[PDB]
Structure 1
């Protein structure tokens, strides 16, 4: 069975009742206040995506991610290039994953016959690891390695022909943590960027890969022609060239609202990012179920029974709705 990711409002409503639009979905890390849609000309809807449409999105992404001249490859969601890591990871070597983290990396790689080593820090890394994977900042804990630590990991693995993959899906709010500007100088470094979370348009399937040209050419060939939609490439070019400072500011305001609601309910926050909070509670799974009975979806983890990941609400009313559900919740037994 596939991983039960956040966002499962359809399945939650079927089990707990209510209309999907009446649920408060706090089970993802998506910006709850989507940016206004830019114009998408009819040409972008009608035609197979043109090289010019691709190139403009790549140029905007290079400026936006500060890639020091590397033109990022647009991909139809970073999930699509996660599915392709078996073709890149050095054959007959282990993969080390800084965890616990987003589950698709281990799922995809183990399904392809790779041996996956769960690690918590760099001192566990060896020459047996053909690929090292860091989600930075981490999903779901928010742990952030400094760029210098990431580059030291890369340099150490490079000696044995190992690669370092840094998934910066949740890194837009802290661009000073990014190593997306180091692809050419490091040589063995790959960076995934995700478009949906920060901009709040996760209905679009769009990410970007920053890497050396031989690696980008490989991903491009594996994905095949017309991999990313015309509308997605049009929208990302416009939004990345707009005022992203105001996007970050709005997110931090909603994060302050979530902090106040969770702290005021007596919950213990142990980590997170601008876009979600990790709560630790001895009955986290029962909290998740009781919140579902209030038609509020949050994210629980089968590997961490005391963990609850709570995303941002869209406004102060939603903050208050969360707080009231916690305050009026029935016995946790």
Structure 2
């Protein structure tokens, strides 16, 4: 039957919302370009330049795509040979790295991080043979911490002329000083993923970026879809990336950080809450006493969180996205 014609790997491979790391409030935007009958630019000029000014890079070092998710796929499609090359990631982390490789047909090499979520440098150096792309989320999802920049430098020296190192900075707006965007001059093999889905409050736009050196970007352009971005998305993205939009964005980051600190202080006092881990993002990882029990309870109360109990070493943990003061108080009361 039809199913027998599909590739073997393809055969084998939810919706108070505080589970997807979205900004809790909707920032309104309206269209300004009524040119829907014509195909859009392959890489919207206004979007690429506005983002390059914001990120502090050159326009030729930016690539716009359908979220950071498409960015993850592009890197594998351009550098990894199916059945020959490997990808490497360090659990517990964002699940789309292995899903894309599994869907495409590339092998996964996993080197779990140390107990403090930091990189197991010696383990990575031992499993690099055959690896073409290394993904590192910093700050990490779901744990919330930054990877020591000194260890990142070591990772970069290890992969020079061997593999591409991709730093997922989907949550960098929360700790802007920790960005590796300035390292592009020093490292040809460094690529960074960015997005408008979190701090920018535009998850519905499906708009992301890849920051890398001209050489890498030019290669990715060869594997990307002819018109990866719609005109309405490029329209709103340029409005959100204007100087006033970047000011409003920072106001949002501020509000979330303040609220995050309140939520962390309150959670520590709660008995069932065994441990609250520090974060430099818009979510909090916390180990609970009988996590799935409390998860179901809140779930039945209309408080949607994200269970991480199945993740390597995240037994008993739930990931809570930071929302409004009313939503935080709602989770506090329920606990």
With the shorter chain as reference, the TM-score category is: 0.7 to 0.9
**8 Å CA contact retained: 2:22, 2:197:** yes
Q: Aligned partners of 2:166 and 2:99: how far apart in 1?
A: 16
Secondary structure of the residue that 1:84 maps to in structure 2? Answer: helix
How far does residue 55 in structure 1 lie from its aligned partner after superposition?
1.2
RMSD, aligned CA: 2.4
1:86 maps to 2:76? yes
Q: Aligned partners of 1:184 and 1:69: how far apart in 2?
A: 14
What 5-or-longer segments of structure 2 have no aligned partner?
1-8, 114-118
Q: Aligned partners of 2:202 and 2:266: how far apart in 1?
A: 25
1:77 maps to 2:67? yes
| Distance change >3 Å, CA 273–CA 134, structure 1 → 2 | same
Question: Corresponding residue for 1:58?
Answer: 48
- Paired residues for 1:245-324 under 5 Å: 245-266=250-271, 267=273, 268-301=275-308, 302-303=310-311, 304-314=314-324, 316-324=325-333
How far does residue 93 in structure 1 lie from its aligned partner after superposition?
4.0
- Paired residues for 1:7-156 under 5 Å: 8=14, 10=15, 24-37=16-29, 39-43=30-34, 45=36, 47-50=38-41, 54-67=44-57, 70-91=60-81, 92-111=84-103, 112-120=105-113, 121=119, 122-126=121-125, 127-128=128-129, 129-156=131-158
Per the normalisation by structure 1, the TM-score is 0.83
How far does residue 148 in structure 1 lie from its aligned partner after superposition?
4.4
How far does residue 90 in structure 1 lie from its aligned partner after superposition?
4.2
Secondary structure of the residue that 1:208 maps to in structure 2? Answer: strand
**8 Å CA contact retained: 1:276, 1:311:** yes
**8 Å CA contact retained: 1:196, 1:202:** yes
How far does residue 288 in structure 1 lie from its aligned partner after superposition?
1.2
Q: CA-to-partner distance for each residue in 1:205-249, whole Å, 9 max, x for gaps?
A: 000011122322232232222211222222222222221331221
Question: Corresponding residue for 2:224?
Answer: 223
Per the normalisation by structure 2, the TM-score is 0.82
What 5-or-longer segments of structure 1 have no aligned partner?
3-7, 11-23, 327-333
Q: Aligned partners of 2:35 and 2:290: how far apart in 1?
A: 49
